[PDB]
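Loading example: each entry is read as three labelled lines plus one structure line.
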Amino acid sequence: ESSPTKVFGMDPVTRQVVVVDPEAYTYDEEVIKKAEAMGKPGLIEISPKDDSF
Amino acid sequence: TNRSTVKISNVPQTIVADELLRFLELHLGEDTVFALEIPTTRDNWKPRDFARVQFTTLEVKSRAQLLSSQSKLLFKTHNLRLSEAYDDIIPRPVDPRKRLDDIVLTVGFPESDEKRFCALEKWDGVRCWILTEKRR
Amino acid sequence: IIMFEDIFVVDKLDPDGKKFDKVTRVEARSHNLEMFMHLDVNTEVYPLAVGDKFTLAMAPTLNLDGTPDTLADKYEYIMHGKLYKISEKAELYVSFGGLLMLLQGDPAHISHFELDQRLFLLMRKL
């Protein structure tokens, strides 16, 4: 719920997070900030791709 | 290893005692922290950079020391460093067996030459603590 | 080509933060030489935790047998700087573009370093 847009999904059969529609991230550093606040610095790493548009 | 209180080197200035207690109980066992005191320069609104925490069992203290030596304690992007303290927060023995609760205490003197004892005043439900380190 | 080379073990970190987004100054003590070192390192791009062991080397040039001003494949944290202060147990003050370094050791260990010269910094965490 920390992400502004629907970029991460929850899988009920595996009880883990999944990546659905990664093109709607909008480069809002909200999920990373939440991960840092929870105490996990290297939980999710998101970087832009230079050769893809 | 003589005491159970461990002095934390650096803690964030914006945190409260409850947050640190919750963090310690999450990383360590549940309700394994007895006393947590954060010194304050002012009366009630300026805590210092360090804090002292008292553990119930020396095994918990050893586990916390091992975790701190491996830099596995990260509370709000701060690496907690654990060091020995000078004095205990509360003079309470680590051994639960030495703690005697709800016992009968009486005073007197060897009144008779034979194996006889006289009771003057008797107290019930007293607490007895044996401190080996403090010799009292 | 390497002037000073020894294994160093970190002792403590100045910020003691994992995601402070700031340059971190480390304190590492030399092994079998008793030398204390101050160095500003970037943790985000080069992680360094307490208790880790890393080697350190200093050479005037990265070329083989001369050509001052191919050791890049061996190390991974190459830097470049100059020595501006040598006065002290002598100590050195080398700044790698604003990143200060303080190598405090023994007078006999550091004797072949001149003032106002360019030197590199070779590092590898084993």
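The first strand of chain A starts at residue 8 and ends at 11.
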